[PDB]
Write a protein that binds this ligand. Structure first.
Ligand code: OGA
Ligand code: MG
Ligand code: NI
Ligand code: ZN
Length: 331
């Protein structure tokens, strides 16, 4: 069995290997990459996403979100307070302001220590889930707006034609902006490209051990767990690496830098934070191997999770027994 310790693997495809996306995901899995829940892919030196990032300042962040924490430094939740619209140029100036800018630090490990010590005492503002793309239309390799759609994959594997679309999303981050512990909708894959700016640190639990994380989370967030049997789908809970180690939870960590892709695998729980002003693009995707994970994905039906239009068909076809309860949580 490849990668039995579930380490995060890093890949360096050649320009030829970068042509066929599906084939390279299957190759990474042949080497055991999915066992980690997360892999890094460094593009060949010949590749670029677009020519420059000099002309992005007029993109609008319609609903910036202030991430307000509650709890203790290593075990906390966050809620998202809506703020007034602002452009990417305005957001970049805000991220660089004395109130929000990255502090002086020695290296990534020092900054990680500072994050976990001090995150809860600040409320950073995040631009999230902005439909759009920064890939040039002429970039033919690993262009996250030109991937095969999840609806087409389901139709190819299972024969059922369904409604829905699958488009990318942009993220604009600052120091201490935080992504809570979660798996993807319907335990899909994700891919994330860091277009520009400062790094993103990731934490991940191997898919084979995800239920260990879920059990700790029920212990640590006992009111939330009573409220909903899949409350991690709410995407509000944080647990630090120190707390995970104290509780024996298997996990790994890695820092993504600008120009690098990350792939998350089905049922790989992940969380992380941004180092300073940055912009990422991400989308969900599927392969044949996903279908069995989609069929078994937990679901939130309490009302909190609310998700895209295109999840309806996935639940309807893959999880007909759960569909009526889930749709009620949508309504
Ligand atoms: O960068 C982010 O805020 C979130 N990214 C992910 O959870 C992802 O691509 O799956
Ligand atoms: Mg612009
Ligand atoms: Ni994710
Ligand atoms: Zn719920």
């Amino acid at each position: 069995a490849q990668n039995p310790n579930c380490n995060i693997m890093i890949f360096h495809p050649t320009k030829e290997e970068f042509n066929d996306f599906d084939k390279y995901i299957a190759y990474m899995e042949s080497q055991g990459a999915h066992r980690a829940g997360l892999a890094k892919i460094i593009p060949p030196k010949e590749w670029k996403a677009r020519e420059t990032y000099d002309n992005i300042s007029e993109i609008l962040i319609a609903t910036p979100l202030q991430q307000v924490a509650s709890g203790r430094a290593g075990v906390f939740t966050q809620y998202h307070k809506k703020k007034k619209a602002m452009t990417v140029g305005e957001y970049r100036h805000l991220a660089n302001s004395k109130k929000y800018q990255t502090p002086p630090h020695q290296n990534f490990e020092d900054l990680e220590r500072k994050y976990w010590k001090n995150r809860i005492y600040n409320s950073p503002i995040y631009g999230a889930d902005i439909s759009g793309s920064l890939f040039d239309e002429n970039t033919k390799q690993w262009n996250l707006g030109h991937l095969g759609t999840i609806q087409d994959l389901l139709e190819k594997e299972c024969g059922v034609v369904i409604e829905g679309v699958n488009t990318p999303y942009l993220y604009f981050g600052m120091w201490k902006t935080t992504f809570a512990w979660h798996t993807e909708d319907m335990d899909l894959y994700s891919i994330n490209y860091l277009h520009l700016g400062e790094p993103k640190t990731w934490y991940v639990v191997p898919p084979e051990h995800g239920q260990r994380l879920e059990r700790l989370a029920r212990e640590l967030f006992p009111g939330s767990s009573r409220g909903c049997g899949a409350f991690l789908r709410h995407k509000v809970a944080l647990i630090s690496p120190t707390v995970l180690k104290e509780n024996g939870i298997p996990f790994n960590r890695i820092t993504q830098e600008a120009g690098e892709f990350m792939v998350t695998f089905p049922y790989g729980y992940h969380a992380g934070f941004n180092h300073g002003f940055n912009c990422a693009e991400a989308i969900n995707f599927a392969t044949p191997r996903w279908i069995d994970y989609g069929k078994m994905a937990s679901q939130c039906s309490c009302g909190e999770a609310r998700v895209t239009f295109s999840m309806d068909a996935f639940v309807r076809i893959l999880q007909p027994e759960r569909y009526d309860l889930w749709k009620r949580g949508q309504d």
